[PDB]
Ligand SMILES: CC(C)(Oc1ccc(C(=O)c2ccc(Cl)cc2)cc1)C(=O)O
Ligand SMILES: CC(C)(Oc1ccc(C(=O)c2ccc(Cl)cc2)cc1)C(=O)O
């Protein structure tokens with residue numbers, strides 16, 4: 594079945610992806626997992642009282658005492674998420690650059706690739722910070738409960754719920770950072786994003802990422818065959834939630850956002 | 863469009 598030939602590179606690929614992955618992002622899944630269980634204490638926001646007291650105890654990077662904050666928790670929260678998304682786009686861009694061969698793609702296609710993959714890999718990586726009760730925030734300094742989010746007014750309460758539903762099923766796969774490094778790499782190099790004009794060199798890379806992932810999944814998960822196909826089917830699900838997130842943006846929008854994000858959502862799908 | 867993104871790839 595499986596041999597030990599020049600698959601040494603496949604493993605060389607995964608090591609390289611892991612090493613830049615672990616320094617590209619703040620909180621690895623390993624680290625967040627330890628916080629979600631104890632060994633290491635975030636402030637828990639379950640309450641409007643805990644909210645109002647959370648913004649006091651937690652040091653959010655996007656806020657400064659001198660600036661005007663909207664009297665509107667739903668809006669003060671969207672603010673932080675926008676700031677974090679802007680930062681996440683930059684961290685994902687840096688990671689994309691470390692994927693062997695990416696920087697030699699046509700720069701117009703690197704842009705297209707990053708445009709469609711960012712939020713998918715954002716939702717993928719968000720699960721690493723979630724359990725069934727809530728999600729870690731502020732580099733693990735805070736913890737916002739799932740049920741408090743759902744209680745926010747009007748449509749904002751419907752933003753994070755699909756993400757929780759995704760994370761629950763997705764975390765049951767019990768992937769680790771080493772697996773996550775190669776999976777997001779496979780996401781970024783999706784050769785079926787709309788608007789690509791030099792596909793073949795992208796597919797060639799994705800295949801190398803795909804077979805490196807499969808080999809990684811067999812070596813690291815003896816207790817579950819078909820983990821590979823299950824992940825691929827997850828990439829299908831990540832697209833649907835993006836489609837469902839945009840429609841929600843529209844609802845709110847017809848009732849703004851950082852030029853980088855507006856740049857990303859403009860003419861998406 | 864994609865000028866902010868295009869700029870980040872150029873680094
Ligand atoms: C930032 C932007 C453009 O749009 C988002 C809008 C909302 C969320 C939330 O998760 C959220 C949930 C509840 C509240 Cl009250 C506030 C925010 C995340 C992203 C994106 O897609 O990058
Ligand atoms: C890379 C990643 C996943 O970056 C994030 C980017 C965007 C968000 C959000 O959209 C969000 C939604 C709800 C809340 Cl309460 C807070 C943030 C979260 C994390 C990380 O940090 O590992």
Ligand SMILES: CC(C)(Oc1ccc(C(=O)c2ccc(Cl)cc2)cc1)C(=O)O
Nearest residue numbers: 648653654655669670673674677731732
């Ligand atoms: C980079 C990071 C994690 O970005 C945030 C993303 C989301 C939030 C929130 O979920 C939130 C909760 C309550 C309030 Cl009042 C405001 C914002 C905060 C910060 C930060 O800045 O540390």
